[PDB]
Amino acid sequence: ARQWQPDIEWAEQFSGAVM
Amino acid sequence: KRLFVVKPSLYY
Amino acid sequence: AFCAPPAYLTHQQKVLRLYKRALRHLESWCIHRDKYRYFACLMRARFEEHKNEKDMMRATQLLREAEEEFWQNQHPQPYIFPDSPGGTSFERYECYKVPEWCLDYWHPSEKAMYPDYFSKREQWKKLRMESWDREVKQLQEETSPDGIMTEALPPARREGDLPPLWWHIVTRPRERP
Amino acid sequence: SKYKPAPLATLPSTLDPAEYDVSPETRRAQVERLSIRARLKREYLLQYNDPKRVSHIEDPALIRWTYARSANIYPNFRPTPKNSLLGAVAGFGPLIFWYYVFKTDRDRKERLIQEGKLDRKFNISY
Amino acid sequence: AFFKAMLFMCSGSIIHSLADEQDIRKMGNITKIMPFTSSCLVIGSLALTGMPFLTGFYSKDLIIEAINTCNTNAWALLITLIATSMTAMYSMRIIYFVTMTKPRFPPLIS
Amino acid sequence: MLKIILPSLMLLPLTWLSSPKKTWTNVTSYSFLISLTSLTLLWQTDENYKNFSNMFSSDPLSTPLIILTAWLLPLMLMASQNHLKKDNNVLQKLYISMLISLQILLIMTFSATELIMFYILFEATLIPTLIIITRWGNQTERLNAGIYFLFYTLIGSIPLLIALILIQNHVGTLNLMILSFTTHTLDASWSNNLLWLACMMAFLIKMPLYGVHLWLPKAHVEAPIAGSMILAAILLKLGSYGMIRISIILDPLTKYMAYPFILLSLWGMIMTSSICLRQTDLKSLIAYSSVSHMALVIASIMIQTPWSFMGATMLMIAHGLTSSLLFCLANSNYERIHSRTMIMARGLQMVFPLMATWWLMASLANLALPPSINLMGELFITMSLFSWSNFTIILMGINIIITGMYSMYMIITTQRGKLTNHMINLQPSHTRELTLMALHMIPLILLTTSPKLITGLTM
Amino acid sequence: MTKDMLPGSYPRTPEERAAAAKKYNMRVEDYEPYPDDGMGYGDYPMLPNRSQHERDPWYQWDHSELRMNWGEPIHWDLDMYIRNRVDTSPTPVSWDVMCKHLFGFVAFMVFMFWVGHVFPSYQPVGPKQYPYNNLYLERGGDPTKEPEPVVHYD
Amino acid sequence: AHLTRRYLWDASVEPDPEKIPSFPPDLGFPERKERVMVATQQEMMDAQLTLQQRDYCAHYLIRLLKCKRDSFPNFLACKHEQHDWDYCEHLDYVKRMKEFERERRLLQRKK
Amino acid sequence: MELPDYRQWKIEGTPLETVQKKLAARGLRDPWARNEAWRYMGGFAGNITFPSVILKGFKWGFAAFVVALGAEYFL
Amino acid sequence: SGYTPDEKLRLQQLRELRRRWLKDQELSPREPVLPPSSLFAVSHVLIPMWFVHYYVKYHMATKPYTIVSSKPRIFPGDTILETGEVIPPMRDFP
Amino acid sequence: APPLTLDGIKDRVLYVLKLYDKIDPEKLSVNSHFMKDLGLDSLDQVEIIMAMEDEFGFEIPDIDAEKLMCPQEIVDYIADKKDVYE
Amino acid sequence: IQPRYREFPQLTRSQVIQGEFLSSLMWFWILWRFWHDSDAVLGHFSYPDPSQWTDEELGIPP
């Protein structure tokens, strides 16, 4: 129903210094 | 003797 | 259609369903009534024999043998009542069975064409809304604690109550609208 | 006996060695089955005829099905023999077959043309 | 065209008269309870067969005359003749199980 | 043409400077008027084509695409009006601006004289599409979809730039009139076969070929709607147009560098329609049908005959209209159930007996119904392919069979059956979404009444 | 929804089998994944290859014209085994003898048509005689050319 | 019944339906009178006949068509005309059977 | 509604007598034959034959034929 | 053995409710309240024939090869309306 | 082809039941059980339901035929199915 | 009109008269056009026995 926007599991992959 | 026929809307 | 089946499904109704479908396929073969009546009496004799065995390891093999010799004489085109599965007129009028909730989207130009109907319908819906919570509570406070359960749908015990889960049985569209 | 099942035209309930077992170990199986069936039936009903239920019912099994058949494929795809060979065949085999078919036809056609023979008595629009 | 239209319409009269039931095992004695429909249905079946002056002759006679006066294939001739016999057979089957035997239909007559 | 693309630019201030309550109306009405004034360039009383400047021209292949691009915008704009109705006004207006940018850039593509103009615009079209797919898609796979849809295109298009640059350094002009009258036969070397591939395997990606089509389902399934309309209606045709323009400078290499692509198109058309026969997702079913249709256009352009280019144009326009129509019809149910699964809701034609006629007509357009510009195209390219080789009808017939099957199966398992009585949220209908289907179908009937226009360069 | 409610990979442990069957709403002794040949099948159950005709027609299912319930795991092939498409219902006659009878009948028909082609049934009569040289002129004659005076006799 | 005679027994002496004028025409005929036509080509053409239909018996067909046109109501008018056409065609068919039997009796002359 | 009395559906005058006779020879008895007995009683009684069906209206047909033949003689 | 004591009561309650419902589905005598021979030939056969004859006579028979028919199948022994040319008879049969 | 009423159904059901010859025309009532009140078997009940079926021209499923053990239950079943009252 | 249970219903003169009329008209037509045109039994012309013919007619020498 609702537009999907990211969550913490989607954001945590952009915090590892090397990706 | 008569009975209500259930119809969807048929107005729009 | 109205009553839900069990799990175990003991010996007796297996035998009876065999008797029923056998008599029906015989009716199909024996088209004329005199012949079907004769051979139906003969079939009831065949079933009356071995009616009392007290050997559940003999009656079951009699059942298996009878089902096999039924399948080797299964009429390919048996009789099927219309309005029954596999037959004509089965789901014919299903295209003409519109549910009740479609009236909730009607305009106030069609509803004005049928005022007394909706006068009764609104109080029907009020009845539903009033009985719902007590109905849920009744189903909640009658759960089999051992875990196993059935599609039995207990009734209403008190007055002012309604038999639980009734709005889909009641209000089911007619078979010939 | 005188009935040979197949992948189609299956064996009925009436002739299986099962459906006549009267053991005590099949019964509790069937009973837990009926219990699950009835639990989910009462759930679907308690959601069906709840007034103030304005929407539809979500039906998560259908969603699991669609996901298993859409997105859970490549994660669980592991290349193996009978996968790689099968894919190579089913990709490049019909390709080559139709290649040689059309190639033979076109070559024969241009041959019979350049020889100055072919019956094209009225071919105008091509 | 005429045979099939008449046959199907007689069938539809027989059907809609009683309930939606379409099977000859529950049709019974239609010569008497429906004289008009039976008369027309029998006319149609007879004309479907090569009856000598009812529009089935004026083709089918020439058809079979042509096919046993031509030099094409003998198995085709033979099985077409057998099939004409079978046409007579199933026409008689309808006329028997629908129009001649005793009632098999339910007892509420409408 | 300038009189068509300056008003299209003025539609942007019309969005931003209008009231929040009188912005969809004004822009929609004025877009319809742009579509109207885009009919002056159907005044071709002669054989010579219409050059308005060094920049802009318009041939009988340009003009239908021009008109269809100008005509889709009101339809996209009204279809996009139920969703993003609860969105902030700036977000609405950004959507409108992206759609109008698509309109402008696509008109500039189909009107371009040079190939570099066409290149930079064919690639500028990626940015609105990506934004629409990503900021306004409902699901989480939209991001991977945008990446696929962008990078397939760019991978194909960089060699295209290299080949155009080569052609400029070799000839000097890169204009299409002059490349027509000055085209040297090619020496038939690997250095020129690579040129053929570089010129073609940007458009063949976008059409698409069956070897490379995975961007199109992932995008159609996940773009909100209007992106799907465009991606089915003219972005695929933006490759066919390019092939028809660029093939003239590649003779005689098309006689033998085309076997793989004709063959891939044919077999993969069969493969895609078989997929359409068995597919849980309706918005994917439409997409694989689009692949199975555009494959015929690929083969047809490869054959380079008059009948073939003709039928390609016809199929292009017809497929665009009917595919946009089918995407609208699926969105009409998705705006209520919020599910693309088709077997979920399967017993309509009770509640929506009029939309169920638009469904039927949309499908009959899809399958080969004769009095229709779909069957005219399919038949003429079938005739071209039979002239080419008589053994191709064996494949076209399998396609025809499967294409009746999946379309009628769609209709049946979506409309016919028993109503899903557990769906109280089936609201009656929108006059908006009825007018949508009417505006998609009435053109099909008109163009069937007069297909003299809808042909191409050759008729 | 979320991950634990959706499919995954082959469970390969008894506790994972149990969690998967509890996810799919099945009895653990009935759960049976696909055999891990390496494909898209993960933890999704294998169900019996039986059509939706074989389900009880009288039971008022929750999904009528599909013969399923709101849970009730869906066979992988619930786009072909529906009532509209494919029927694995039994028959009074077996597959083997049915195919044997049909193919034998067809082959006998072909053989007898060949036998009739080699043993035609001609009426004991000659060919028709056409007067003007088999109508040479009425069938594209090229009148400037002289004809071939083929002539019949009484 | 003239098919048993070649498929079952006494084969290779009964005629084939093709090659019916196998032997020459004048064998055993000291003199011959060729068959005549009475309907000329222009009449037979301008009457708009079909190629299968414009055989030796076409003049009675022309007469039948003249009847069926002029006396169009009362389409039952001229049956004698159709009788004459049918009679001439029966005689043509008898000539055809006569050629068959000639060739049959002549293949026995060999042996 | 009006219905007839249930005290007239009898087997005597039907093939149901032969049914019960063969079945008593076999050593048994048949119920329900009175239910299946209205089919063989009045109106629905009597064996109508295929000649009776196929020769329907033949009387008046032959009469009209003779009449038209006499008219043919006199005209 | 049939319905249990509770199933029978469930059934009776639902029967009462169902019968009430079906009686509530009856229409009053006022319910659908609302606000209120050759002419067939001359309005369905003659006007289309007028338009069609106009088309056939002034847009089809004008253009060259719209209407094409076979020859009128002359016979021996008739005078021709166009030229008076008498076709002769057939030579006498025996 | 007119509809059917609860009194008509009752009359027809008792008409069918007054011709089995194991149930004599007396000894029965609208609530009369078959086994305990008339000494009937199970197969006899199956034959009785067959009689109802080929009377009214429709099928009673076996699961529900196992429950019908009084003529009023039959009348209630046919009344609920065919939607008789109004 | 009314229905009738287990008994034979009263028949209208219309339907029986019309059925009798159609059937009798069929039989009249058959008798008439078979008396006149009895060319289904055999035609005006005879199938000649060829075996009994001469050979002078066929012109055969020994």
Asked if E26 has any chain C CB less than 8 Å from its own CB, the reply is yes
Closest CA relative to residue F440, chosen from F362, F337, F325, F339 = F325
Q: How far is the C-alpha of G62 from the C-alpha of G82, rounded, in Å?
A: 15
- Check: CB of residue F117 under 8 Å from CB of residue F60: no
Of J71, J76, J91, the CB nearest to H62: J76
b (16+ CB within 10 A) / e for F355-372 = bbebbebbbbbbbbeeeb
The chain K residue lying nearest J11, using CA atoms, is K76
Tally helices (H) and strands (E) across chain G: 2, 0
State in Å, rounded, how far the first CA of chain E is from the last one: 30
- Record: contact F280-D66, CB cut-off 8 A: yes
Of E42, E99, E102, the CB nearest to I39: E102
J with B: 3 or more CB pairs under 8 Å?
yes
> F130 Cβ partners below 8 Å, 6+ apart?
F146, F149, F150
- Record: contact L40-E38, CB cut-off 8 A: no
Structure tokens at J19: 């019968």
The chain D residue lying nearest F340, using CA atoms, is D66
Closest CA relative to residue F283, chosen from F244, F341, F234, F336 = F341
Which helix (DSSP H) or strand (DSSP E) does residue J13 occupy?
helix J5-24
- Record: contact C110-B4, CB cut-off 8 A: no
- Record: contact E21-K2, CB cut-off 8 A: no
Interface residue of J69, J73, J79, J86 to substitute, partner H, most H CBs within 10 Å = J73
Q: How far is the C-alpha of H109 from the C-alpha of H104, rounded, in Å?
A: 9
Interface residue of D67, D101, D102, D112 to substitute, partner F, most F CBs within 10 Å = D102
Q: F289: domain range? A: 2-459
Structure tokens at G58: 């009288």
The distance of Cα L35 from the centroid of its chain, to the nearest Å, equals 10
CA distance G41 to chain F (A): 16
Q: How far is the C-alpha of H45 from the C-alpha of C63, rounded, in Å?
A: 83
Asked if B12 has any chain J CB less than 8 Å from its own CB, the reply is no
Beta bridge partners of G33: G45
Residue F112 DSSP code: B
Helices (H), chain D: 24-48, 60-70, 84-114
- Record: contact D55-F424, CB cut-off 8 A: yes
Structure tokens at F213: 């089509």
Q: How far is the C-alpha of J17 from the C-alpha of J22, rounded, in Å?
A: 9
- Record: contact K66-J2, CB cut-off 8 A: yes
Asked if L42 has any chain E CB less than 8 Å from its own CB, the reply is no
Of G7, G50, G97, the CB nearest to D72: G7
CA distance I74 to chain K (A): 53
CA distance C96 to chain G (A): 15
Structure tokens at D20: 């006549």
**Active site residues per annotation of K:** 41
Q: Contact partners of B by the rule of 3+ C-beta pairs under 8 A?
A: C, F, J
* Three-state SS annotation for B1-12: CCECCCCCCCCC
Q: How far is the C-alpha of F379 from the C-alpha of H23, rounded, in Å?
A: 55
Beta bridge partners of F281: F341
Of E37, E40, E61, the CB nearest to L40: E61
Residues in chain F within 8 Å Cβ distance of G84: 409, 412-413
Q: How far is the C-alpha of D82 from the C-alpha of D94, rounded, in Å?
A: 18
Q: Which residue, chain included where needed, has tokens 């849920």?
A: C136
What Å resolution does this PDB entry report? 3.0
Handedness of CA E73, E78, E84, E87 (dihedral sign): negative
Residue at F157: amino acid letter: S
Cβ count within 10 A of residue E34? 22
Residues in chain K within 8 Å Cβ distance of L3: 1-2
> F453 Cβ partners below 8 Å, 6+ apart?
F42, F60, F63, F64, F447
Residue at F83: amino acid letter: H
Q: How far is the C-alpha of G36 from the C-alpha of G55, rounded, in Å?
A: 29
Cβ count within 10 A of residue F338? 14
- Record: contact J74-H46, CB cut-off 8 A: yes
Residues in chain C within 8 Å Cβ distance of I26: 42
Residues in chain E within 8 Å Cβ distance of L6: 107
Q: What Rg do the C-alpha atoms of chain D give, in angstroms?
A: 30
Which helix (DSSP H) or strand (DSSP E) does residue F456 occupy?
none
Structure tokens at G51: 């059509």
Q: Contact partners of G by the rule of 3+ C-beta pairs under 8 A?
A: C, D, E, F, H
Report CA-CA distances (Å) from L45 to C57, F408, J40.
81, 60, 55
The chain A residue lying nearest F133, using CA atoms, is A3
- Record: contact K58-C81, CB cut-off 8 A: yes
Q: How far is the C-alpha of F318 from the C-alpha of F290, rounded, in Å?
A: 11
Asked if C60 has any chain D CB less than 8 Å from its own CB, the reply is yes
b (16+ CB within 10 A) / e for C165-175 = bbbebbbbbbe
> K46 Cβ partners below 8 Å, 6+ apart?
C16, C19, C20, K65
Q: Is G114 left (phi over 0), alpha (psi -120 to 50) or beta?
A: alpha
Of K69, K80, K86, the CB nearest to J15: K80
Q: How far is the C-alpha of G43 from the C-alpha of G8, rounded, in Å?
A: 6
- Check: CB of residue F427 under 8 Å from CB of residue F434: no
Burial level of F70, CB count in 10 A (0-12/13-18/19+)? buried
Report CA-CA distances (Å) from D6 to D11, D16, G89, G113, L13.
8, 13, 11, 33, 60
- Check: CB of residue C150 under 8 Å from CB of residue C4: yes
Residues in chain F within 8 Å Cβ distance of C91: 418
Burial level of I22, CB count in 10 A (0-12/13-18/19+)? middle
Q: Contact partners of D by the rule of 3+ C-beta pairs under 8 A?
A: C, F, G
Residue at J70: amino acid letter: S
Residues in chain H within 8 Å Cβ distance of L61: 27-28, 109
Residue A14 DSSP code: G
Burial level of J49, CB count in 10 A (0-12/13-18/19+)? exposed
Asked if H108 has any chain J CB less than 8 Å from its own CB, the reply is no
Measured CA angle at F393 (ends F391, F395), to 5 deg: 90
Phi, psi of G10 (to 5 degrees): -50, 130
Cβ count within 10 A of residue I31? 17
Max Cα–Cα distance, chain A, nearest Å: 35
CA distance E22 to chain C (A): 8
Residue H78 DSSP code: -
Q: What is the DSSP code string of F205-240?
A: HHTT-SSS-THHHHHHTTS-SHHHHHHHHTTTHHHH
Structure tokens at C144: 């089999």
- Record: contact F136-A3, CB cut-off 8 A: yes
Q: How far is the C-alpha of H65 from the C-alpha of H78, rounded, in Å?
A: 10
Q: How far is the C-alpha of H108 from the C-alpha of H14, rounded, in Å?
A: 8
- Record: contact C106-B6, CB cut-off 8 A: no
Q: For chain E, give the number of residues.
A: 110
- Check: CB of residue D6 under 8 Å from CB of residue G87: no
Residue at G133: amino acid letter: N
Q: Which residue, chain included where needed, has tokens 């008339």?
A: K38
Structure tokens at I21: 């006779």
This structure was determined by cryo-EM
- Check: CB of residue C155 under 8 Å from CB of residue J6: yes
The distance of Cα G73 from the centroid of its chain, to the nearest Å, equals 26
- Check: CB of residue I31 under 8 Å from CB of residue C32: no
Closest CA relative to residue F237, chosen from F110, F349, F410, F338 = F110
Handedness of CA C121, C127, C130, C133 (dihedral sign): negative
Asked if J26 has any chain B CB less than 8 Å from its own CB, the reply is yes
Q: How far is the C-alpha of C153 from the C-alpha of J6, rounded, in Å?
A: 9
Phi, psi of G35 (to 5 degrees): -80, 10
> Chain F neighbours among G 3-62 (CB < 8 Å)?
none
Measured CA angle at F281 (ends F275, F283), to 5 deg: 95
- Record: contact G65-F412, CB cut-off 8 A: no
- Record: contact L50-H101, CB cut-off 8 A: yes
Q: Is J89 left (phi over 0), alpha (psi -120 to 50) or beta?
A: beta
- Record: contact G84-F412, CB cut-off 8 A: yes
Residues in chain G within 8 Å Cβ distance of F284: none
Phi, psi of D64 (to 5 degrees): -60, -40
The chain H residue lying nearest L60, using CA atoms, is H28
SS3 F175: strand
- Record: contact C106-B5, CB cut-off 8 A: no
- Record: contact C101-F350, CB cut-off 8 A: no
Structural domains counted in chain F:
1
Residues in chain G within 8 Å Cβ distance of H32: 153-154
